[PDB]
Design a protein around this motif. Structure first.
Motif, short mmCIF file in Angstrom:
data_model
loop_
_atom_site.label_atom_id
_atom_site.label_comp_id
_atom_site.label_asym_id
_atom_site.label_seq_id
_atom_site.Cartn_x
_atom_site.Cartn_y
_atom_site.Cartn_z
N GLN A 186 0.95 -0.71 -0.25
CA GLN A 186 -0.06 0.18 -0.33
C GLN A 186 1.06 1.55 -0.07
O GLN A 186 0.34 2.22 -1.32
N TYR A 187 2.00 0.77 0.99
CA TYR A 187 2.74 2.24 1.01
C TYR A 187 3.40 2.55 -0.33
O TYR A 187 3.32 3.76 -0.85
N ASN A 188 3.80 2.00 -0.80
CA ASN A 188 4.68 1.90 -2.15
C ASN A 188 3.72 2.48 -3.62
O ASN A 188 3.83 2.98 -4.73
N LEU A 189 1.57 1.41 -3.23
CA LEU A 189 1.53 2.30 -4.15
C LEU A 189 0.54 3.54 -4.01
O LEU A 189 0.49 4.41 -5.12
N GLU A 190 0.45 3.96 -2.78
CA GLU A 190 0.46 5.75 -2.18
C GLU A 190 1.55 6.10 -3.47
O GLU A 190 1.11 7.69 -3.80
N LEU A 191 2.69 5.89 -3.14
CA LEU A 191 4.40 6.64 -3.65
C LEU A 191 3.67 7.14 -4.48
O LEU A 191 4.10 7.86 -5.70
N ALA A 192 3.74 5.65 -5.43
CA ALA A 192 3.53 5.41 -7.01
C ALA A 192 2.20 6.92 -7.56
O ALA A 192 2.03 7.82 -8.62
N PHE A 193 1.22 6.25 -6.54
CA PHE A 193 0.19 8.16 -7.02
C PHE A 193 0.38 8.77 -7.04
O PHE A 193 -0.13 10.24 -7.62
N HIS A 194 1.18 9.08 -5.63
CA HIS A 194 1.53 10.55 -5.63
C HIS A 194 2.60 11.64 -5.86
O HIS A 194 2.50 12.49 -6.47
N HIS A 195 3.42 9.97 -6.37
CA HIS A 195 4.31 10.89 -7.68
C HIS A 195 4.22 10.71 -8.68
O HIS A 195 4.47 11.99 -9.75
N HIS A 196 3.23 10.03 -9.39
CA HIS A 196 2.70 10.50 -10.70
C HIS A 196 2.21 11.86 -10.36
O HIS A 196 1.67 12.76 -11.50
N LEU A 197 0.89 12.37 -9.85
CA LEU A 197 0.20 13.50 -9.55
C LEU A 197 1.43 14.55 -9.12
O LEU A 197 1.07 15.53 -9.98
N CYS A 198 2.65 14.56 -8.50
CA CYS A 198 3.67 15.33 -8.28
C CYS A 198 4.04 15.67 -9.75
O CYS A 198 4.27 17.34 -10.29
#
Ligand SMILES: CCS(=O)(=O)c1ccc([C@@H](NC(=O)Cc2ccccc2)C(=O)Nc2ccc(C(O)(C(F)(F)F)C(F)(F)F)cc2)cc1
Ligand code: NA
Lengths: 252, 12
Positions: A186-198
């Motif tokens: 979940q932490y890595n998928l959250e980083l992936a989503f937030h990285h994409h938004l950034c």
């Protein structure tokens, strides 16, 4: 078991964005272009009246079949999601039982036209009045409101891919045996989503996403309304509802 | 007692 069950580097997170978007593209059920093109194809007053004249049980059966078809695509999405097949079967089932309907509810915003408050159903777009025979007006109005609120975010397909992967991989679901494995995925998928938004200058959507309690409320209402219908037409549920739908929502 | 998820998960 999986790289994403431990701390992932920036390069590994970039790979994860691509992997999740690919998994979603391959299992999205209907193409966004196909849904958009069909927006002008709206049920006529005569067609709406025909759906309204259908029996409550025939309309429940049709909607349960359409939802089950959507759920089958979500199960395939889950199977393609990095790390999911490395979880134990108990946990894969816990996550799908709790999350498949939430993912379908999110995906449904693609099929919802906020301009005229219609949804793609059985080949054309219809308003909430199309579903009046179900006898669950509050639940339908709640699903249309939810789709309207997500429509206002103007999600891209990659944003839906990453947001739905997170809806599914939720380490808080009761019943998970390997909770720490799910927490790290979940932490890595959250980083992936937030990285994409950034990267796409879309971090402003984070404060606008619905709270988890909203998806939970919708799923709870669906199970409650199904229980009411099942008490009225028990043999319709036993004889003509899809087995997967009963496994997820009526304990088999 | 319907159990389909196990089948879908194991079908490769
Ligand atoms: C969810 C993935 S996606 O966005 O690709 C995608 C959206 C809409 C449909 C739509 N496809 C059909 O109808 C099947 C078809 C098409 C053509 C001819 C005959 C048959 C579809 O299934 N709609 C649909 C809407 C609403 C519902 C509710 O159950 C709910 F509660 F979810 F809103 C209902 F209550 F409104 F009915 C249930 C189902 C399928 C996929
Ligand atoms: Na929409």
């Amino acid at each position: 078991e999986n790289l994403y069950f431990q701390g992932a580097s920036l390069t590994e997170i970039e790979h994860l964005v691509q992997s999740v978007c690919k998994s979603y593209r391959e299992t999205c059920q209907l193409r966004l272009e196909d849904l958009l093109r069909q927006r002008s194809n709206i049920f006529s007053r005569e067609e709406v009246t025909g759906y309204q004249r259908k029996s409550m049980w025939e309309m429940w059966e049709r909607c349960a079949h359409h939802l089950t078809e959507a759920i089958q695509y979500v199960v395939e999405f889950a199977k393609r999601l990095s790390g999911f097949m490395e979880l134990c079967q108990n946990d894969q089932i816990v996550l799908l039982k709790a999350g498949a309907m939430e993912v379908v509810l999110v995906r449904m915003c693609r099929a919802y036209n906020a301009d005229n408050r219609t949804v793609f159903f059985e080949g054309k777009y219809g308003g909430m009045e199309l579903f009046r025979a179900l006898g669950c007006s509050e639940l339908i109005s709640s699903i249309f409101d939810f789709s309207h609120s997500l429509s206002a975010l103007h999600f891209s397909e990659d944003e839906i891919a990453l947001y739905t992967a997170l809806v599914l991989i939720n380490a808080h679901r009761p019943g998970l045996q390997e909770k720490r494995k799910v927490e790290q995925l979940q932490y890595n998928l959250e980083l992936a989503f937030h990285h994409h938004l950034c990267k796409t200058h879309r971090q402003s959507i984070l404060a606008k996403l619905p709270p988890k309690g909203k998806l939970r409320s919708l799923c709870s209402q669906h199970v409650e309304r199904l229980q009411i219908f099942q008490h009225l037409h028990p043999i319709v549920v036993q004889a003509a509802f899809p087995p997967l739908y009963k496994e997820l929502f009526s304990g088999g | 007692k319907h159990k389909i998820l196990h089948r879908l998960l194991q079908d490769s």
